């Protein structure tokens, strides 16, 4: 036999809608990826180059100097109980986006991955892996 767990709720591949009215009344469109079959959301270059540089992304040399202020907040100490505020100060997580070949989010529901871009101000995302081997890829 070859089947999985069935369901009848709302989501992306299952349905196409959103939660009750709020601040973002619309519906984004990210590319899903069955990482369970291959590995993760790392391979994706069929139609993403078009959105590789939407705005001025050539003068980002001043974005690396903020690498030392990545912990300017305090989540590093509230880890054991850090209420992930991925909405109010979501723009504070300015990691090394310049060296993040990965631009997708991960949803823990059944077994699927999402990859496309970052949301402006909505509530249909959860995990987000941007860090990637910018050059060296040792075991560490």
Swiss-Prot record:
The keyword Plastid is annotated on this UniProt entry: no
Primary location class: membrane
Keyword Phosphoprotein carried by entry: no
Paired cysteines (S-S): 24-122, 41-113
Glycosylation sites: 75, 125-126
Swiss-Prot/TrEMBL GO biological process terms: adhesion of symbiont to host cell
Localization per record: Membrane
Function per UniProt: Involved in parasite invasion of erythrocytes.
Family to which this protein belongs: Belongs to the apicomplexan parasites AMA1 family.
Protein's name according to its UniProt entry: Apical membrane antigen 1
Part of the intact protein present: 309 to 436 of 622
């Amino acid at each position: 036999m070859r089947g999985s767990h069935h369901h009848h709720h709302h989501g992306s591949n299952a349905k196409f809608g959103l939660w009750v009215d709020g601040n973002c009344e619309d519906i984004p469109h990210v590319n899903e990826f069955p990482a369970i079959d291959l590995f993760e959301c790392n391979k994706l270059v069929f139609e993403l180059s078009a959105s590789d540089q939407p705005k001025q992304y050539e003068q980002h040399l001043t974005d690396y100097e903020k690498i030392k202020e990545g912990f300017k907040n305090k989540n590093a100490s509230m880890i054991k109980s850090a209420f992930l505020p991925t909405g109010a100060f979501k723009a504070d997580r300015y990691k090394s986006h310049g060296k993040g070949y990965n631009w997708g989010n991960y949803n823990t529901e059944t077994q699927k991955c999402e990859i496309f871009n970052v949301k402006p101000t909505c509530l249909i995302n959860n995990s987000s892996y941007i860090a990637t081997t910018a050059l060296s890829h040792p075991i560490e």
